[PDB]
């Protein structure tokens, strides 16, 4: 499969999540994603084919994971935007007020701005601390997907938000949305990963 930020993948033939970013760990190929998407050794599938397994994750506390893929997968330095792509150029962290977009299998590519950092989400499983909040909308299934600036600086992977009864926060005003992401930096250093860039 061609690995691109934003596409759908399933875990153990049950749950759906979105790919965050293509990365390498030495000769091993992988993608970073949300920790709540799977447990260590869960099987990831893209378009019905096995592409790898969860190699590590932390959730709750943090919300991160990496999937090590088989050699046959093609890593790309890109994030889906409809039919087009946003190129990954690096991981400079943007500041409060910066514009940012996210990509995932349920709402597609949405943009907004960062509104706060170091936020705590009280999920049913336990608190997740240190998330950055943006007001781009997101829906059930967008978790794990990419958060990136239009300039290509990868910011993190989607964790959660204040979804309404329709499964997203897109039908409420941006001023009222809380869409949260886990910062990418600590995930790369924690797992010794390198981002694929172009």
């Amino acid at each position: 499969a061609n690995i691109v930020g934003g596409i759908e993948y399933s875990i153990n033939n049950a749950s759906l999540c979105s790919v965050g970013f293509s990365v390498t760990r030495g000769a091993t190929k992988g993608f970073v994603t949300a920790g709540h998407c799977g447990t260590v050794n869960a099987t990831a599938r893209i378009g019905g084919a096995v592409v790898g397994t969860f190699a590590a994750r932390v959730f709750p506390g943090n919300d991160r994971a990496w999937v090590s893929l088989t050699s046959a997968q093609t890593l790309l330095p890109r994030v889906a935007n409809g039919s087009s792509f946003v190129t990954v150029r690096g991981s400079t962290e943007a500041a409060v007020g910066a514009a940012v977009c996210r990509s995932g299998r349920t709402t597609g590519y949405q943009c907004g701005t960062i509104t706060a950092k170091n936020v705590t989400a009280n999920y049913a499983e336990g608190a997740v601390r240190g998330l950055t909040q943006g007001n781009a909308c997101m829906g059930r299934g967008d978790s794990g997907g990419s958060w990136i600036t239009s300039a290509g600086q990868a910011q993190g992977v989607a964790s959660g938000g204040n979804v309404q009864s329709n499964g997203n926060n897109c039908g409420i005003p941006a001023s009222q949305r809380s869409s949260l992401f886990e910062r990418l930096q600590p995930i790369l250093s924690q797992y010794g990963l390198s981002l694929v860039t172009g």
Partner: peptide, 4 residues
């Protein structure tokens, strides 16, 4: 908030 909920995870996703």
């Amino acid at each position: 908030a909920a995870p996703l």
